[PDB]
Amino acid sequence: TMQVSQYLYQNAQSIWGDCISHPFVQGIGRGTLERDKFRFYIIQDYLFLLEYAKVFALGVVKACDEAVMREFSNAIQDILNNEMSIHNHYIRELQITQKELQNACPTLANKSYTSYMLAEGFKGSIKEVAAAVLSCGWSYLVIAQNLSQIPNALEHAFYGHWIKGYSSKEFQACVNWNINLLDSLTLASSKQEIEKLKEIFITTSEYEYLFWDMAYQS
Amino acid sequence: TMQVSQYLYQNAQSIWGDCISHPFVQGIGRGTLERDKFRFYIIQDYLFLLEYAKVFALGVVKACDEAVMREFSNAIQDILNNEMSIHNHYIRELQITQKELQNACPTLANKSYTSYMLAEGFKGSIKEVAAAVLSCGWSYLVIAQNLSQIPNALEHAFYGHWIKGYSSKEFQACVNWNINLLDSLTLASSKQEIEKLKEIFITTSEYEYLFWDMAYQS
Amino acid sequence: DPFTMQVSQYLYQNAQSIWGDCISHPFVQGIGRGTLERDKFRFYIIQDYLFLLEYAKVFALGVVKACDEAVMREFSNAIQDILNNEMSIHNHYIRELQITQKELQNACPTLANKSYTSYMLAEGFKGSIKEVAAAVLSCGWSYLVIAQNLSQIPNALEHAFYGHWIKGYSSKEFQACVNWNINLLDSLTLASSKQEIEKLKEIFITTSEYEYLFWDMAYQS
Amino acid sequence: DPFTMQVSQYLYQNAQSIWGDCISHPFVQGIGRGTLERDKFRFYIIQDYLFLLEYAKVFALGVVKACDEAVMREFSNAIQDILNNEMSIHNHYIRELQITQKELQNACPTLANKSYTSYMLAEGFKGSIKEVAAAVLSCGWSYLVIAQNLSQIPNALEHAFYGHWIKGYSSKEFQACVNWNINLLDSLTLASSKQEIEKLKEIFITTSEYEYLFWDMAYQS
Numbered sequence: 097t098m099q100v101s102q103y104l105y106q107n108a109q110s111i112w113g114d115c116i117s118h119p120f121v122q123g124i125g126r127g128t129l130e131r132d133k134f135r136f137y138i139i140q141d142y143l144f145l146l147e148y149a150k151v152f153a154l155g156v157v158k159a160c161d162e163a164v165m166r167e168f169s170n171a172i173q174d175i176l177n178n179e180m181s182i183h184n185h186y187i188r189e190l191q192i193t194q195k196e197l198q199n200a201c202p203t204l205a206n207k208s209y210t211s212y213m214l215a216e217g218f219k220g221s222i223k224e225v226a227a228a229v230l231s232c233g234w235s236y237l238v239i240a241q242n243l244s245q246i247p248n249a250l251e252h253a254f255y256g257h258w259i260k261g262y263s264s265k266e267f268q269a270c271v272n273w274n275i276n277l278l279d280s281l282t283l284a285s286s287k288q289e290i291e292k293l294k295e296i297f298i299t300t301s302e303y304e305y306l307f308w309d310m311a312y313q314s
Numbered sequence: 315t316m317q318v319s320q321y322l323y324q325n326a327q328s329i330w331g332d333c334i335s336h337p338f339v340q341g342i343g344r345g346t347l348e349r350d351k352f353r354f355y356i357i358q359d360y361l362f363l364l365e366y367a368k369v370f371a372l373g374v375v376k377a378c379d380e381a382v383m384r385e386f387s388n389a390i391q392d393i394l395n396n397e398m399s400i401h402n403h404y405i406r407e408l409q410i411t412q413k414e415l416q417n418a419c420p421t422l423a424n425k426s427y428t429s430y431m432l433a434e435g436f437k438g439s440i441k442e443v444a445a446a447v448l449s450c451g452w453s454y455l456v457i458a459q460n461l462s463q464i465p466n467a468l469e470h471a472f473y474g475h476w477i478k479g480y481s482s483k484e485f486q487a488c489v490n491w492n493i494n495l496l497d498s499l500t501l502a503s504s505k506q507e508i509e510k511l512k513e514i515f516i517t518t519s520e521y522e523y524l525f526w527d528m529a530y531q532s
Numbered sequence: 533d534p535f536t537m538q539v540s541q542y543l544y545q546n547a548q549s550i551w552g553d554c555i556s557h558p559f560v561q562g563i564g565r566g567t568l569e570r571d572k573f574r575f576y577i578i579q580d581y582l583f584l585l586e587y588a589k590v591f592a593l594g595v596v597k598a599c600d601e602a603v604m605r606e607f608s609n610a611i612q613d614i615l616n617n618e619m620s621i622h623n624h625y626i627r628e629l630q631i632t633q634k635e636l637q638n639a640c641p642t643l644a645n646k647s648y649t650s651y652m653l654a655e656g657f658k659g660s661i662k663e664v665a666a667a668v669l670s671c672g673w674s675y676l677v678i679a680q681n682l683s684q685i686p687n688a689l690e691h692a693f694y695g696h697w698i699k700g701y702s703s704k705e706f707q708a709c710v711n712w713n714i715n716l717l718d719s720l721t722l723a724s725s726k727q728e729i730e731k732l733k734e735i736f737i738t739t740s741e742y743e744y745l746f747w748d749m750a751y752q753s
Numbered sequence: 754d755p756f757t758m759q760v761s762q763y764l765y766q767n768a769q770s771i772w773g774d775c776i777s778h779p780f781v782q783g784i785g786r787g788t789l790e791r792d793k794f795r796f797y798i799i800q801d802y803l804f805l806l807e808y809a810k811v812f813a814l815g816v817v818k819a820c821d822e823a824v825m826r827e828f829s830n831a832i833q834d835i836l837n838n839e840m841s842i843h844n845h846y847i848r849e850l851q852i853t854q855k856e857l858q859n860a861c862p863t864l865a866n867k868s869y870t871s872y873m874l875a876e877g878f879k880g881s882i883k884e885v886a887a888a889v890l891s892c893g894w895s896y897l898v899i900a901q902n903l904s905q906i907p908n909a910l911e912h913a914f915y916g917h918w919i920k921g922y923s924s925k926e927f928q929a930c931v932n933w934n935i936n937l938l939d940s941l942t943l944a945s946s947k948q949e950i951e952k953l954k955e956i957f958i959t960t961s962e963y964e965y966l967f968w969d970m971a972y973q974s
Contacts, residue, residue, distance in 0.1 A: 146380060149387070150879075156371035156390065157432075158658055160731065162364060162416070169367070169390045172374065176384055198380070204962055208868035211875035214375075218878050219597050219810075221660035286723045292599070302864060368658075376879055378952065422741055426647035429654035436657050437589075437818050439881035504944045510820070520643060585822055588829070595813035595832065596874075601806055601858070605836055608809070611816065611829050637822070653817075 100282045100290055101275045104230070104297040111301040112235050116242050118305070120312040124259065125243035127252050131190065133314040134255075138186045140311060142179070143202045147210035149175045151217050151229055158222040167273060174270070182261045189254070205310040209303035216296055223285070226278045227293045231300040233271045236262045318500045318508055319493045322448070322515040329519040330453050334460050336523070338530040342477065343461035345470050349408065351532040352473075356404045358529060360397070361420045365428035367393045369435050369447055376440040385491060392488070400479045407472070423528040427521035434514055441503070444496045445511045449518040451489045454480045539721045539729055540714045543666070543736040544673070550740040551674050555681050557744070559751035563698065564682035566691050570629065573694075575753040577625045582641040583746075584622065586649035588614045590656050590668050597661040606712060613709070621700045628693075644749040648742035655735055662724070665717040666732045670739040672710045675701045760942045760950055761935045764887070764957040765894070771961040772895050776902050778965070780972035784919065785903035787912050791850065794915075796974040798846045803862040804967075805843065807870035809835045811877050811889050818882040827933060834930070842921045849914075865970040869963035876956055883945070886938040887953045891960040893931045896922045 115121060120137070123129025152175065155168035187197070202210075217225035240262035243249050250256050261267065282293070333339060338355070341347025370393065373386035405415070420428075435443035458480035461467050468474050479485065500511070554560060559576075562568025591614065594607035626636070641649075656664040679701035682688050689695050700706065721732065775781060780797075783789025812835065815828035847857070862870075877885040900922035903909050910916050921927065942953065 146383070149383070150375040153371045153374035153387075157368040157375075160658075165364070165367070166394055169371075169387075169394060172387045173391060176387060204868075204959070204966070207872060207959065208864075211871040212867060214875035214878070215871040218874070219599065284723070284725045289723070299864075299867065306864070378879075422647075422738070422745070425651060425738065426643075429650040430646060432654035432657070433650040436653070437820065502944070502946045507944070517643075517646065524643070585825065588825070589817040592813045592816035592829075596810040596817075604806065604809070608813075608829075608832050608836060612833060615826055615829060 099279050100285075100293065101230075101279050103290070104227070104294055105234070107294055108231065108235075108298055108301045111298065111305055112238055115235060115305055115308060116239055118308045118312070120308045121239060121243070123312075124255050125249045126246055127249075127255055129255070131254075133312060134186075135190045135192070136314040137311040138183055138190070139192065139197065139200050140203060140206055140307075142183055142187075142197065143200060144206050144210060144307075145175055145179055145183070147202075147207075147214070148229070148232065151210075151213045151225060154214070154217045155222060155225045155229075158217070158225060160222070164222075164277065167277070171270075182258060185257055203310050205303070205306045209300070209307060212303060213300065223278070223281045223289075223293065224296060226274065226281055227296045228300060230274050230278060231297055231304055233267075233274055235301065235304050237268060237271045240267075317497050318503075318511065319448075319497050321508070322445070322512055323452070325512055326449065326453075326516055326519045329516065329523055330456055333453060333523055333526060334457055336526045336530070338526045339457060339461070341530075342473050343467045344464055345467075345473055347473070349472075351530060352404075353408045353410070354532040355529040356401055356408070357410065357415065357418050358421060358424055358525075360401055360405075360415065361418060362424050362428060362525075363393055363397055363401070365420075365425075365432070366447070366450065369428075369431045369443060372432070372435045373440060373443045373447075376435070376443060378440070382440075382495065385495070389488075400476060403475055421528050423521070423524045427518070427525060430521060431518065441496070441499045441507075441511065442514060444492065444499055445514045446518060448492050448496060449515055449522055451485075451492055453519065453522050455486060455489045458485075536722075538718055539724070539732065540669075540718050542729070543669070543717075543733055546733055546737055547670065547674070547740045550737065550744055551677055554674060554744055554747060555678050557747045557751070559747045560678055560682070562751075563694050564688050565685055566694055568694070570693075572751060572753040573625075574629050574631070576750040577622055577629070578631065578636070578639050579642060579645050579746075579750060581618070581622055581626075581636065582639060583645050583649060584614055584618055586641075586653065587668070587671065590649075590652045590664060593653070593656040594661065594664045594668075597656070597664060599661075603661075603716060606716070610709070621697065624696055642749055644742070644745050648739070648746060651742065652739060662717070662720045662728075662732065663735060665713065665720055666735045667739060669713050669717060670736055670743055672706075672713055674740065674743055676706065676710045679706075757943075759939055760945070760953065761890075761939050763950070764890070764938075764954055767954055767958055768891065768895070768961045771958065771965055772898055775895060775965055775968060776899050778968045778972070780968045781899055781903070783972075784915050785909050786906055787915055789915070791914075793972060793974040794846075795850050795852070797971040798843055798850070799852065799857070799860050800863060800866050800967075800971060802839070802843055802847075802857065803860060804866050804870060805835055805839055807862075807874065808889070808892065811870075811873045811885060814874070814877040815882065815885045815889075818877070818885060820882075824882075824937060827937070831930070842918065845917055863970055865963070865966050869960070869967060872963065873960060883938070883941045883949075883953065884956060886934065886941055887956045888960060890934050890938060891957055891964055893927075893934055895961065895964055897927065897931045900927075 120129060120133070123133075149172050152168050152171045155171070156165050159165035159168060186192075213225075213228040216228050240259050243259050244263050249259055252259075282290070285293070338347060338351070341351075367390050370386050370389045373389070374383050377383035377386060404410075431443075431446040434446050458477050461477050462481050467477055470477075500508070503511070559568060559572065562572075588611050591607050591610045594610070595604050598604040598607060625631075652667040655667050679698050682698050683702050689698055691698075721729070724732075780789060780793065783793075809832050812828050812831045815831070816825050819825040819828060846852075873888040876888050900919050903919050904923050910919055912919075942950070945953075
């Protein structure tokens with residue numbers, strides 16, 4: 097016995113640990129992080145989400161099964177009109193000018209992380225893409241679950257909304273869909289295939305750490 | 315002067331001509347086509363639409379511009395939940411068993427046409443994909459505009475709905491978006507690039523004829 | 533092994549009838565017993581030339597999708613072969629006939645030509661490296677058997693003109709090349725589900741159908 | 754031409770500062786005047802070996818995206834070169850040092866390694882063949898200038914160990930290879946909009962940034 101999604105989670109434990117206790121993330125949980133830094137983040141994360149949707153697009157093209165191919169398409173819609181909760185909230189809450197947005201550059205860390213998901217999806221099958229997009233969602237879910245106790249973490253007039261977002265029932269459903277998808281796609285892969293998937297999954301986990309890092313370096 | 319979308323249309327005129335006057339299509343316009351044949355068609359067209367959505371997915375990944383990348387994503391949603399007007403109407407109007415559907419095989423003509431759009435999109439830029447998906451929509455629009463006068467073509471208890479569908483204001487908006495997209499993407503391409511686009515556009519036009527053909531061969 | 537189903541053998545099984553129709557096609561028969569008119573064969577090798585360009589691209593996809601240097605390298609060689617081994621077969625016949633260097637890159641592929649190469653491309657691009665191994669196999673394997681079969685008429689090989697073609701696709705090099713492809717596919721798939729094998733089989737018969745259609749249009753020349 | 758902006762020249766302009774930082778990097782300087790310790794260089798050519806495998810894949814993408822046999826064929830040769838010209842440079846140093854055949858395919862690429870190759874891949878796959886021509890250019894061009902510069906110390910070339918490396922990337926072959934890439938890019942782009950050129954420039958500087966980061970991590974060895 098061993099489900100692949102649990103096995104991957106197991107090997108990512110340490111890294112998500114560092115993420116939860118990163119100055120930037122702890123900064124979100126106890127209101128200590130300064131707006132300047134968070135502003136820089138949500139602009140970068142916006143650029144990041146545009147490239148992330150493309151990996152989901154890749155899922156549409158590589159799914160051979162209308163159910164899954166359709167699930168991915170909804171994912172793309174969510175990424176574009178659910179930030180129409182989180183990211184948009186903060187672009188007008190801070191004041192990100194419509195122009196300033198599409199004037200921004202992704203940082204090397206940003207681009208590296210999205211290129212890597214994209215490239216691994218393109219070189220492999222639909223298992224790789226299900227694997228490559230998993231860290232991102234899952235990690236944010238644990239992170240927000242964790243920050244959920246301070247308390248007043250949720251009460252916070254500004255950072256409260258972000259935490260509320262990534263710990264909601266929808267976000268969790270979404271992560272669950274991705275967990276289940278990956279398990280169903282893989283109950284038949286060899287020891288060697290699972291290794292490769294595991295390698296993708298930690299690698300994207302590393303990029304998450306690097307991302308928070310460059311976000312704080314702001 | 316010459317807009318590329320008009321120039322492409324120009325060279326496709328003859329072929330769409332043959333399409334409008336094809337026994338299968340005329341059969342739709344004057345109620346003469348037998349259900350058996352149409353049944354076989356909507357099952358094939360269903361398979362075809364699944365592969366077609368993937369080309370739109372390709373558009374998401376190849377668009378570098380949030381506006382267009384988002385327009386493509388809506389296209390994918392339409393293809394999947396607008397057949398939840400046309401195709402679904404006829405699957406329960408005829409009686410296509412849920413199983414029978416995903417049991418069906420595409421025919422060589424079907425696969426050839428979708429592989430070709432896919433392959434040309436993948437080998438080129440976002441101009442090729444905007445070009446590769448255009449025949450399909452545009453041609454159906456002219457075809458339904460044409461069948462729109464018989465009359466009683468629209469009145470027909472069975473075939474009326476299909477004609478109504480592809481001549482509606484939404485479908486036309488949709489075709490227009492695709493026309494405009496292509497023109498804006500190309501006002502800067504060389505004589506040689508336009509040639510290539512033209513070649514894609516007639517080639518897909520040919521596949522449309524072949525498609526009606528195999529549909530009638532039913 | 534060997535009490536265990538081999539996918540290549542299973543694929544081959546399901547293509548049997550189609551390859552039969554191919555061996556006994558007017559055009560192929562015509563090659564085996566000198567009866568086919570040069571006009572038709574000219575048209576053919578012009579089309580086959582275009583076809584071979586797009587076919588290289590699928591092997592190129594093999595390089596990008598192979599994660600393993602040995603296979604990644606075997607694919608690269610395959611691309612080189614396709615480019616400079618027609619520098620046996622295709623070139624032989626372009627100067628043997630007289631295909632002007634211009635005339636070549638002036639030619640259009642036919643719907644059948646495009647359809648076939650589009651399909652291998654799209655299936656490779658949508659899938660993993662198993663799909664590409666499966667998508668390029670019909671073409672090599674079937675020419676192998678066809679040439680093996682035409683190999684007895686005899687005087688099939690003796691023929692001053694069509695002899696070289698048959699000689700080509702029955703050589704030990706082409707043979708080894710087809711075997712590499714068979715083995716590659718078997719090593720990549722010894723762990724795939726019933727459903728995955730089905731999909732690969734469906735790719736194999738489809739490209740087999742395109743081969744028959746290809747000869748057809750070559751004869752329709 | 755030639756009162757008309759050349760994109761390759763414009764790209765080169767914007768990479769100037771970065772390539773400067775590269776030439777004067779501890780690691781590169783270390784090569785130019787024998788001071789760099791073998792441990793670090795060993796680590797490097799192991800990483801560079803992994804890197805070169807993924808780099809071939811981008812040229813492979815060039816084959817599939819080139820629509821023109823000449824360029825499609827030039828890319829194929831580039832892949833062959835990358836595989837059997839390290840059969841000068843990389844192989845030299847694997848036996849010169851002693852890299853066990855196993856040790857090789859046992860190595861992991863580093864985040865910096867992966868990031869760089871992922872980026873060239875993804876940008877090539879998302880774009881047309883102009884993007885691939887642009888994505889693989891930094892790497893060749895910058896090593897060219899670096900080797901040209903290290904070419905004077907002298908005794909830089911004389912050095913019994915590091916000499917061969919410098920000799921390699923300043924040869925007339927590597928030179929011709931970089932020129933092919935420059936010319937290809939200019940022919941593909943003489944019709945592109947301001948906005949398209951910007952995107953290509955952004956690809957060029959980005960891969961230039963990855964080069965610097967690459968040397969960095971090689972020295973961090």
